[PDB]
Every structure is written in structure tokens, then in C-alpha cells.
């Protein structure tokens, strides 16, 4: 009976979704002028790393970056001068995520150690120091983004997300509902609700205040690797191993676009939008990064400049540049 | 021209020097991905080193070994086994006193897209009590296709053949060994294997392999 109740609820949810799907973006974007051929070139190269780079994150000042690499060094870069203004030795070199605080005062990093490390930058003593260790996850840390200088939310490899109070280090609000382990995590511009992407091919929206899932989206065929909110917070795109990215809308509560092309047979590592939200930048396994016109799913250009897998991707808050790290141990900043 | 930011440039160069020194020190170490099933013998192996992920380390005969034991993590391995690409070798171990899960795992990882050219040091652990299990429990129940006697050495050889058959490429080698539940020599076996591996990598860098 209860299984039948669940099946009936799923069926009526699907029926309501079909009723709400009066059109698709493909037939409404028939009058939009495409972005054309995007020709981009590397403007900076950060070649201080010594092994694979898994994570990066720009700064809200749009000048300083943070990079996480297998070398065990979390080095803050000067994107204009190429100076390495800071260099943090990690307690564990198995790092796949990093975060730069919106104020720039703090920086977060984590990985297979199940711990999100919060490092204080504006230290009175002059050296970068760990402020507190975020522990409690039973799975590996996959992504983490700051709400402010005190609140951070961390994705994990145990199908759960957690929102942290850095002052106490406890789990202010824990998140459950994914059936597979979670790979990505991104925050809305209003910072009132976020989404997470898990290997169960499902991306779902959560409330930071109460932890209740607000809209669960499905449609992917394989594991979700990356998610980025649209600049308005009313949509987000997902990155998956199936060589396809898909766009989900919160109000429509259903998938809206799928970014596919037969020439790609490899998964997406990281995804992010531009400032206007027209460009969807996805890092791929085949050594290159494509640019996706989020309104038309067009492949407007290729950011092919890495000798190995491009893994991490971030875009300036000013919209000036995108930096794509890779396993080639070199970052690259583009325009 | 440059302002007093020359001091920032000097700090950047100092950071570069420190990073280069740290990397030169790090490349001196040998990275090993310890691996296997639950209770297969990874814990015993790191115990014999005499010292989420636990990166057990030890030094032996002028080499610095780091055992990256990733068996304490219950998660999909397809999302984090790539973190261990470009290690010196894999110390994958199995339990003879089990089994099909170990064979499936070895087929998945020995032929993984990241370890297709990475040597694997297969340790058939738990030899002493498997020597009693073979007498008490016929191996035919563990391997229905086993067309051979129930004597010990041939059963061990049959398990060796079943494990070694999983390789699909001619550019990788598998160093099978038996831990015999006493060890005190697996350090030497690992040392010989990683010596061959580092010599091969040196040859490849020099074009000799």
C-alpha cells in the first residue's frame, strides 16, 4: 500500500509537471540572437602548483583566488600580478574543494579527510592559520561555499549536506534526502536556499533555514558532478558524467534544457555561469572546457588549453574572467 | 614601472622557492595506494609498517613510503579513485580465508581507466590459516570451475591464476606474493617492486622504456 502510495504520488507529480510544461525553451528562443563564436585566450597562467588541481574559487574582490591541489598547498594567487600572496600547507593533500569567503577574510578547503578546514587570512601574526576544523561528515567532502564570515554549508560523499556555524563548528542544520553521495553545492544570490548535486542523477533544492527540500529534480542518466545557480537564483545547471549538462528551474520544478553533443563522450568536472548567465562554462574530462549558451545549448567555443583533465572552474564576481584549473598543475585565466 | 610592489614580487619569489624545495622533498617519497576488501589485511600491512583516508607512512632502505589506505571510506569509488592516479603502485591485498567480491574489485581496479599502466602488488594475505581452510573446506565451493586437486600449493596457484587473468593490457605487471600472516618481509617485496617501477619511470623519462 505505502509503496503504491509513493508510486501514485510520483505519478501525480509527473502529471502536474507535464501540465505545467506548456512549452520548452527551444521553441521560445527561436528569436534570440546567439552569442556567436566565442574566441577566448589565456590572459594569466599560475604555474606554481606541482600536481593535480581539483578545486579553485575566485574572490568577491575579483582579484584573489584559492587553489586546492594534490601537492598539499592551498595557495592564494594574485590574478593580476601572478604573485602567490599566500601559501598554506594542508594537513592532508587529498583536497577536492576550496572556498573563498565573501569578505576575503577566510578560506575553506577539504577533501577525503572528511573535514572542512577554515583558514584565517587576516591574521594579526601575519601567517595563515586554521581557525577551526569542521568535522561530522561520514563521507568525503566534495564542495563547500560560504554564506558569510560565520556560516558555511558543505557537501559530502555520504548523501548529506550540512550547514555550519564556524563560531561553534557545530551542524546548525543538517540536510538529508539524496540517495547517492553529493558532489557539488552552490548558493543562491539571495543566500536563502541552495541546491546540491549527487551521484543518484538527482539535483534538489534545500532551505537553509529549516533544511526542508523544496523541489527535487531528476532526468539525468548518470552521476551529477557540478551545479551552479543562475545569477538570479531561480534556475541552476547541473554537470554529470553522461557528457550532458541539464538546466533546472525552481518555479517550474522540472528540467528545462539539456546540454548534449555527440562529439563528447566524457563527463563534466565543474560548471559555472557568467555574470549575465548567458554562458554556461563546464569543465570536461577530455582536456578541454566548452562554453554553453544557457538559453540555446549552443557550443559557442572551446577553452582547450590544458594538457590534462580540466577539473575546477570559477568566474569573477565582476564578470571579468574565468579561471580553469586542471590536472596539468597549471591554472589559466581567460577573457 | 613597478612601485614598492617589488616587495610583493619578492614575497612571491620566496614562496616559489619554498614551494620548489617542498616539492623536491615530496618527490623523494614513494606513493602507494593500499587497497583491498574489508578485513583483507590492509590493517595488518600498515601495522607491519611499525608506526576517511589514513596515509600511513614509513621509511625503509633509504626510501620513504606512504601507504594511502582508502578502505575506511564507504562511498562510490568511481568518484575518488582518480585521486590516487599517478601513484607509484597499488598494494591491493585479498584474504585467502574468505572471495568473489575481492575478484570483482580486482577486475574493476586492475583494469580501471586510471590504473591501466600502474603496477599492482597483489598480496594474497592470510596464508597460514588458508592452509587449514583448504583441508577443512574444499576450494571447489569457492571456485566451481576449479578443475584441480585439493592439495595446498596447486590451490594457491589456481587462485593466483584466477587473479592474474584479469589483466587486459601488455604494458603492466602484477607482483603476486603471499603475506603468510607473519610478514617481516613484505617491506622487501614492496621495495623491489617500487624499485622496478621507479627505474621504469626513469627509463621512460629518459626514453629507455
Amino acid at each position, epitope marked *: 500500500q505505502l509503496r503504491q502510495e509513493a508510486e501514485q504520488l510520483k505519478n501525480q507529480i509527473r502529471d502536474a509537471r507535464k501540465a505545467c510544461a506548456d512549452a520548452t525553451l527551444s521553441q521560445i528562443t527561436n528569436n534570440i540572437d546567439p552569442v556567436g563564436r566565442i574566441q577566448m585566450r589565456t590572459r594569466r597562467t599560475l604555474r606554481g602548483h606541482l600536481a593535480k588541481i581539483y578545486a579553485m574559487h575566485w574572490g568577491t574582490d575579483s*582579484r*584573489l583566488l584559492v587553489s586546492a591541489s594534490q601537492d598539499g598547498k592551498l595557495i592564494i594567487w*594574485d590574478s593580476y*600580478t601572478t*604573485n602567490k*600572496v*599566500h601559501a598554506i600547507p594542508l594537513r592532508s593533500s587529498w583536497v577536492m574543494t576550496c572556498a573563498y569567503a565573501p569578505s*576575503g577574510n577566510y578560506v575553506a578547503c577539504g577533501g577525503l579527510d572528511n573535514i572542512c578546514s577554515i583558514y584565517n587570512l*587576516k591574521t*594579526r*601574526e*601575519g*601567517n595563515v592559520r586554521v581557525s577551526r576544523e569542521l568535522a561530522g561528515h561520514t563521507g568525503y567532502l566534495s564542495c563547500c561555499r560560504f554564506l558569510d564570515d560565520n556560516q558555511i554549508v558543505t557537501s559530502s560523499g555520504d548523501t548529506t549536506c550540512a550547514l555550519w556555524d564556524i563560531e561553534t563548528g557545530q551542524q546548525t542544520t543538517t540536510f538529508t534526502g539524496h540517495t547517492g553521495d553529493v558532489m557539488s553545492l552552490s548558493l543562491a544570490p539571495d543566500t536563502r536556499l541552495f541546491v546540491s548535486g549527487a551521484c543518484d542523477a538527482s539535483a534538489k533544492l534545500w532551505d537553509v533555514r529549516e533544511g526542508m527540500c523544496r523541489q527535487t529534480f531528476t532526468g539525468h542518466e548518470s552521476d551529477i558532478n557540478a551545479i551552479c545557480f543562475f545569477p538570479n537564483g531561480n534556475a541552476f545547471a547541473t554537470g554529470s558524467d553522461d557528457a550532458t549538462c541539464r538546466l533546472f528551474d525552481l518555479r517550474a520544478d522540472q528540467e528545462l534544457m539539456t546540454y548534449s553533443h555527440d562529439n563528447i563522450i566524457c563527463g563534466i568536472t565543474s560548471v559555472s555561469f557568467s555574470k549575465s548567465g548567458r554562458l554556461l562554462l563546464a569543465g570536461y574530462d577530455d582536456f578541454n572546457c566548452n562554453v554553453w549558451d544557457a538559453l540555446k545549448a549552443d557550443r559557442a567555443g572551446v577553452l582547450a588549453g590544458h594538457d590534462n583533465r580540466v577539473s575546477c572552474l570559477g568566474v569573477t564576481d565582476d564578470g571579468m574572467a574565468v579561471a580553469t584549473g586542471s590536472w596539468d598543475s597549471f591554472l589559466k585565466i581567460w577573457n | 614601472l613597478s*612601485a*614598492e*610592489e*617589488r*616587495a*610583493a614580487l*619578492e*614575497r612571491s619569489k*620566496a614562496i616559489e622557492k619554498n614551494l620548489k624545495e617542498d616539492g623536491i622533498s615530496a618527490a623523494k617519497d614513494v606513493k602507494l595506494l593500499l587497497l583491498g576488501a574489508d578485513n583483507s589485511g590492509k590493517s595488518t600491512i600498515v601495522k607491519q609498517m611499525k608506526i576517511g583516508i589514513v596515509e600511513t607512512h614509513f621509511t625503509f632502505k633509504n626510501l620513504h613510503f606512504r601507504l594511502f589506505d582508502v578502505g575506511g571510506q564507504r562511498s562510490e569509488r568511481k568518484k575518488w579513485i582518480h585521486c590516487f592516479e599517478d601513484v607509484t603502485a597499488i598494494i591491493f591485498c585479498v584474504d585467502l580465508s574468505d572471495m568473489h567480491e575481492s575478484l570483482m574489485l580486482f577486475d574493476s581496479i586492475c583494469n580501471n581507466k586510471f590504473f591501466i599502466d600502474t603496477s599492482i602488488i597483489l598480496f594474497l594475505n592470510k596464508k597460514d590459516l588458508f592452509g587449514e581452510k583448504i583441508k577443512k573446506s574444499p576450494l571447489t565451493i569457492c571456485f566451481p570451475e576449479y578443475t584441480g586437486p585439493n592439495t595446498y600449493e596447486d590451490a594457491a596457484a589456481y587462485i593466483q591464476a584466477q587473479f592474474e587473468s584479469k589483466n587486459r593490457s601488455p604494458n603492466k605487471e602484477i607482483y603476486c606474493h603471499m603475506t603468510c600472516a607473519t610478514d617481516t618481509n613484505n617491506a622487501q617485496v614492496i621495495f623491489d617492486a617500487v624499485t622496478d617501477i621507479i627505474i621504469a619511470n626513469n627509463l621512460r623519462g629518459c626514453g629507455l622504456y
Partner: single-chain antibody
Amino acid sequence: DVQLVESGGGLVQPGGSRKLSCSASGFAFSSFGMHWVRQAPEKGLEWVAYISSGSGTIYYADTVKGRFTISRDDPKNTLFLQMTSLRSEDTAMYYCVRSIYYYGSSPFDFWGQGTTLTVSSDIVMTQATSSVPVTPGESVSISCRSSKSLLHSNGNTYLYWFLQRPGQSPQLLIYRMSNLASGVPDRFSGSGSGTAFTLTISRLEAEDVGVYYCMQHLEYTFGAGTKLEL
């Protein structure tokens, strides 16, 4: 907490020589490009020495070049400034100055207690007033001028503001003329451009009584000093 205590001062016969030590504690001295500056008993501050991180870059004053030498011993966390052939113009209280240089950093963010030493194309900073009367809760504007433009082509303007309380050590208020230094109340503020500068203070208290110096950091220089009193 950060501390800088110096030693090696006292009485020196004319023509003599001695070395001054800056014992550092409470911070990672190895990555700090410490300075050493002095103040005559009835004059403004003046630049003397500068040693970079790792002892890779060093400069001295024009009246001191080839006459003194600055040394850094990082493992012992001590800064050395050996002075040779002391003259009548070298008597002063010497302040060890802490500094670290990266983007968004606060140079000159800490100063030492000081040691008295007694004997028996340059950019010049000028202050139009030496002393003005102030009242608590009022608003004042303290200004100083520079001979050369402090605004670099990259947009940064290298002007710094310091306050000298009576019987105390100078403390940084504003670095790069706009960014208020850590540990200072928001009451202070800085503004200006090109060759003219000013410091805007509102809601003054007794803690603001002192002498205000301004320093330019564009090229290898303090002002005269403006005193506030009731």
C-alpha cells in the same frame, strides 16, 4: 600578541659606533620586512633603514647610506641595526617598525617601544599646521602635502597616517590613505588625491590627543607633525 622591544641605546661618545637590536615576539618575523626609524626629541620622524623578508633587499637613508648597516637574524627573531661613526645629528629615539608586503596588506602596522641614543628627487612631506585646538565630540580635518604625486598608475596612493600619543609609540591609523587599519575605531577616516591629502576625524575623545604624522611609501620620509590638544 605582537611585541617589539629594542635594546642597545644609551650614551655614546662622539665618533663612536654601536649596534641596536629589535627583539621580535608574538608573530612570524621571518615573513615580515621590518624597518627601523627614529625620532629626534624635538623633531618629526625620519626613515633610516629597511630590510626585506629573507634579507634579500635592503636600503638606507641618504644621510645614513654607507654609514650604518641593518641585519636580520630570523631564527632568533631579532633585527639588528649596526650604527657606525655616530654624529650630532643621529641622537634620537629609535623605533623598530614591522611591515609585511602583499596585496591588501598593512605595512607599518606595528611599532616598537623605542630606545634613546644620545651623543655629545627626494619626496618631502610638509604639514601646514603644527598644532590646533580640539574639543571632545567636535570634528577636525588634519592635512599634509607631498612634493610628488603619491597616486601610482595602478590606482593605489601610498600615503600612511600615524598618531603619536604623549609618552607612547606611534600606531597606524590609515594605510594607503583609504583603508583604516585593524584595531582602530571607525571614527577616523582618510581622503585626498594627487598631491593634497587630509585626515577627517569626527567625535573626538581624549584618546585622540597626540601628534599626527603622514608618510609616503611610493619610493625610497615623514611629515612635520600636527599636535591636537584642548
